[PDB]
Design a protein around this nucleic acid. Structure first.
Ligand SMILES: [K+]
Ligand SMILES: [K+]
Ligand SMILES: [K+]
Ligand SMILES: [K+]
Ligand SMILES: [K+]
Ligand SMILES: [K+]
Ligand SMILES: [K+]
Ligand SMILES: [K+]
Ligand SMILES: [Mg+2]
Ligand SMILES: [Mg+2]
Ligand SMILES: [Mg+2]
Ligand SMILES: [Mg+2]
Ligand SMILES: [Mg+2]
Ligand SMILES: [Mg+2]
Ligand SMILES: [Mg+2]
Ligand SMILES: [Mg+2]
Ligand SMILES: [Mg+2]
Ligand SMILES: [Mg+2]
Ligand SMILES: [Mg+2]
Ligand SMILES: [Mg+2]
Ligand code: NA
Ligand code: NA
Ligand code: NA
Ligand code: NA
Lengths: 212, 105, 71, 100, 101, 56
RNA sequence: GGAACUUUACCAGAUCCGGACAGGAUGAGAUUGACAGAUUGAGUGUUCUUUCUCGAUUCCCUGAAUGGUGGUGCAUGGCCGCUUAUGGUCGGUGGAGUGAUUUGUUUGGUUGAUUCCGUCAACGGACGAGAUCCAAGCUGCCCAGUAGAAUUCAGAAUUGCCCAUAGGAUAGCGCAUUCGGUCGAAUUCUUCUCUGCGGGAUUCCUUUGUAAUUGCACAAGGUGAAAUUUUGGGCAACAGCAGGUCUGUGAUGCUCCUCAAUGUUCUGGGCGACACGCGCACUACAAUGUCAGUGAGAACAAGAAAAACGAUCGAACCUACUUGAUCAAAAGAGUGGGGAAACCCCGGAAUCACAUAGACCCACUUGGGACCGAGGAUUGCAAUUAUUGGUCGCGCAACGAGGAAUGUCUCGUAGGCGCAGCUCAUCAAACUGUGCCGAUUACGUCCCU
């Protein structure tokens, strides 16, 4: 029987959740910045966003075919019905998932916490971001655990508008003494096109037309 | 947990063994006298209903029971009969409640 | 409690400065002017601005108002 | 549910692993794993294929990923060469991921 | 021969940016149309505790998922209908072809 | 012999032992509504990717 | 976190290695698996007797490794709760101090509001508040063969003289009413319903009101569907807590066990065990009632399955109708429909109503059903420690309004009343929502916290 329309979207959501999780673990070393799919009658067209496009494709498209085999076998895709593409992030410093993975890799490379977190913040605001906040917590200064937050710029924290103007991501960094949690929130600037911006004015800002 | 200080197992055991019954009765109560109401009509009681119950300004099954020392179930039955013979008239009526009154002249 | 916050008061002072000639003593015609000379995500704030612009205009007709500069 | 894998079933699993450079198997002790191997199809218990990939991973012949009760194993360059030696396939034979 | 066009999606904006396109393409095809009906919006509700351990005030999390559905009935042949539907939709919108008798 | 005795109750496939969590294979506090079969704790982390949004 | 097995972490016992890999001793006989008898709780090759089968996958021992609902939340991540439901918080440059620090961020009025106006050694900013978002009410366009309505033809029903076993009150004074099975046609339309963007409300209007001696505002009334954060929620800063969780995870450091295991399965039991104390509910103590009838009548919602199995559908899931029925309930069957605005469904919920001329009549009583006995059916691999209904018994079990104390609440609210989802093979005195009937009191204060 056809699944109820309320059961088809649940299946579609659960499938995307698993697909997102698989690529997060597989493409952690690259700046995996989301995945989108477009199911048509002929194929599926799964598209992967990452900062290091060359590292996810491999040589002569080796790794992207390994990922295609992974998804094909997991979800039982007939041959030729699944296609995978990878596209580059327009602004690397405006992606919280790419910046949080960069920060986690810095910490695992024995970088200093204040130096690494500060280095992320400058790069984020060199890219045109309105604000940025980086949080690092865990066993940084000894047996006792402390959480240190570094801020710069604007950042709204209340209401629902902060879910469309702020890009956020968190990661677990497993160090020798224990796991360390890193959070990166980036307040996106507005865009006329909306390609890498919320594309709407701030909910509280009120501009007045200059008389002509 | 609030583990009581210096409380024994013998202290525990003696506490539950003495905790049966005893403390109760937080209300005064103020018992009442029983109501001896007849469930069927006697000759003299039925005579009162046919004569004394009319020419009452307000007639109600609970009132008649308070006068003739009878149950309300048969007090209402007699009132329905007195209406069938037009001795009393029914002013207010429902399934649960009936009000009667004496006829004029 | 119906105080106009500083976002409404500042924006309504900007509108009076820029479009004093077009404004009036009534809410509904002024609110129409506020609709196209302002960009805001919220209709409620545009409604509160139109209410305070009319309050400024009634204040201006009686005398000068601090915070409003008309050349 | 036994980990005493047969030699023919190990060879069939290794043949699928070389033909398709990846094997995806569900993490459950009951249940069975299904593969094609070009023509027809074959089935082996999930615990047995997981047992084979434990050996390969401990020998650094595969890389292992796990997400949502599902395993993902991929042969590496040393693992591919071992499969050619074990399956006795002639040189220049490569998996569909390697093949253009 | 009436053909039924069923559109359903999670996105309110995308669910009718295809119905408007389907309505427009058929108007360019001059095929008589029974207007797009907005079927009732069904909300999927899941209410769970916020905590992972059962400590503190018992606070809950109400999660909602809305489904938007539209239908267009048009008197057009299968070939003509396939022309109307042969264009790129957005992600997360599925369109169903159904023939009514 | 021992092979048949192994996991006999599990192959029956009824009760809370049969049902587990599709993300972490946990048998406690499972959301079976809409056939999600997701933990209540795993749901709150994956609710946005599935499509559920937190309003009112 | 409603535990029959499982879950399950505990207890009494029995299996398996799910000890990868590396180095050695065996080895094409390394090993695997087993019918019969007995060992055993086990027609459990667990082991044993006896052999057959398998085949280089494995066994033996040394290190190692893995797994764990093992410890430690006082080693941690993440999330949550709380401080803390109020209005709070922080730089830069300038001023003041030897300095911690201070000013800004202050007093006056106002506001739920560090909300505004004014003043000013501060000037410029940032976050929280507000704004934003989601649902309700009023309304626009769109819209229907998954929603409906009004007419016109036909077909059928009532039809006028009627005064209840006592029969009051309550609209009618060109064409008389009905008839979702009469499963009848035709035509017209969007009054109800569906809904993606809109509109609409803001102190907008008025006081010879308060205040004003600029202002920011306030109170009554008006307009209005709505009259003050419109109503109800969601989000919610900065600083913390040795708050909770290592029993959510393939989140995790250190440490513990690791082949008669703290791993993992299987059998059985336990989590339920009762002199007792406490939290939170359910049912009551009756007549503004209990029974037995009859009427009119909601809203939110849920409904079936795979790379399995049979011939792309078809069965699981929910139901309606009929039957069982030539005689109890609960059942059991057959047919059809529904992937869910399509079937359930014109969603016949219970409070409620009844001038029902119904029974009871103040009593631990036809109140109240605790407790227990016997029959029967259903769910399940398994019902004993009653799984759950239904039938007849018990009702002589307390309980007649509850001491000191104490919880929550301001209008479609409290209280009452059901219904759905969720846990769910079976099982709500639970929670999460939903609608139904619907008040008393206050429009305050800083006495208590
Ligand atoms: K279900
Ligand atoms: K377990
Ligand atoms: K913590
Ligand atoms: K505060
Ligand atoms: K100084
Ligand atoms: K006040
Ligand atoms: K909160
Ligand atoms: K905090
Ligand atoms: Mg803000
Ligand atoms: Mg707010
Ligand atoms: Mg139970
Ligand atoms: Mg265990
Ligand atoms: Mg664990
Ligand atoms: Mg703690
Ligand atoms: Mg200060
Ligand atoms: Mg504070
Ligand atoms: Mg057991
Ligand atoms: Mg318990
Ligand atoms: Mg019984
Ligand atoms: Mg519970
Ligand atoms: Na200074
Ligand atoms: Na300063
Ligand atoms: Na641990
Ligand atoms: Na006080």
């Amino acid at each position: 029987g056809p699944l109820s329309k309320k059961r088809m979207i649940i299946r579609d959501g659960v499938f995307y959740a698993e697909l997102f999780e698989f690529l997060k673990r597989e493409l952690a070393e690259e700046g995996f910045s989301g995945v989108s799919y477009h199911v048509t009658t002929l194929r599926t067209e799964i598209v992967i966003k990452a900062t290091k496009t060359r590292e996810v494709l491999g040589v002569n498209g080796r790794r992207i075919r390994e990922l295609t085999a992974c998804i094909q076998q997991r979800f039982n895709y007939k041959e030729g019905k699944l296609q995978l593409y990878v596209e580059r992030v327009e602004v690397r410093g405006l992606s919280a998932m790419a910046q949080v993975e960069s920060l986690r890799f810095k910490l695992l490379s024995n970088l200093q916490v204040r130096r690494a977190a500060m280095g992320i913040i400058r790069y984020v605001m060199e890219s045109g971001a309105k604000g940025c906040e980086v949080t690092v917590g865990g066993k940084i200064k000894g047996q006792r655990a402390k959480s240190m937050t570094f801020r710069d710029g604007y950042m709204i924290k209340s209401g629902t508008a902060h879910k469309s103007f702020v890009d956020s991501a968190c990661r677990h960094c497993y160090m020798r003494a224990g796991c360390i949690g890193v959070k990166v929130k980036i307040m996106l600037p507005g865009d006329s096109t909306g390609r890498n911006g919320p594309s709407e004015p701030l909910p509280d800002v009120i501009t007045v037309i200059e008389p002509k | 947990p609030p583990k009581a200080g210096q409380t024994k197992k013998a202290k525990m055991e003696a506490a539950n063994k003495g905790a049966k019954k005893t403390t109760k009765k937080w209300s005064k109560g103020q018992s009442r006298e029983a109501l001896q109401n007849a469930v069927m009509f006697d000759k003299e009681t039925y005579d009162k209903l046919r004569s004394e119950v009319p020419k009452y300004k307000l007639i109600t099954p609970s009132i008649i029971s308070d006068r003739l020392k009878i149950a309300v179930s048969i007090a209402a039955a007699g009132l329905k009969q007195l209406c069938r013979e037009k001795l009393i008239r029914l002013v207010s009526c429902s399934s649960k409640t009936r009000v009667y009154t004496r006829i004029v002249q | 409690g119906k105080i106009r916050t500083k976002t409404v008061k500042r924006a309504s002072r900007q509108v009076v400065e820029k479009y004093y000639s077009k404004l009036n003593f009534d809410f509904y015609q002024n609110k129409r002017v506020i609709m196209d000379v302002t960009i805001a995500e919220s209709k409620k704030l545009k409604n509160k601005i139109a209410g305070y612009t009319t309050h400024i205009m009634k204040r201006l007709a009686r005398g000068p108002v601090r915070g409003i500069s008309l050349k | 549910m036994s980990t005493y894998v047969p030699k023919p079933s190990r060879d069939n699993v290794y043949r699928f692993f070389f033909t398709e450079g990846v094997i995806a198997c569900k993490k459950d002790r009951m249940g069975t794993w299904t593969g094609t191997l070009g023509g027809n199809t074959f089935t082996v218990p999930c615990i047995q294929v997981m047992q084979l990939m434990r050996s390969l991973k401990s020998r650094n012949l595969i890389k292992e990923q796990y997400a949502w009760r599902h395993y993902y194993w991929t042969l590496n360059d040393e693992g591919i060469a071992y499969m050619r030696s074990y399956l006795h396939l002639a040189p220049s034979a490569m998996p569909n991921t390697q093949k253009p | 021969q009436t053909v039924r066009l069923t559109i359903t999606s999670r996105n309110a904006k995308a669910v009718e940016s295809v119905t408007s396109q389907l309505l427009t393409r058929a108007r360019d095809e001059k095929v008589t149309i029974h207007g797009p009906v907005r079927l009732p919006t069904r909300t999927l509700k899941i209410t769970t505790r916020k905590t992972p351990c059962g400590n503190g005030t018992n606070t809950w999390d109400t999660f909602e998922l809305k489904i938007y559905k539209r239908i267009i009935d048009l008197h057009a042949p299968t070939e003509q209908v396939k022309k109307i539907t042969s264009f790129t939709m957005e992600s997360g919108v599925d369109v169903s072809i159904t023939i009514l008798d | 012999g021992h092979l048949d005795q192994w996991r006999s109750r599990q192959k029956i496939g009824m009760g809370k032992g049969a049902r587990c969590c599709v993300i972490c294979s946990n048998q406690k506090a499972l959301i079976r509504k809409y056939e999600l079969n997701v933990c209540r704790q795993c749901f709150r982390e994956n609710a946005e990717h599935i499509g559920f949004t937190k309003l009112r």
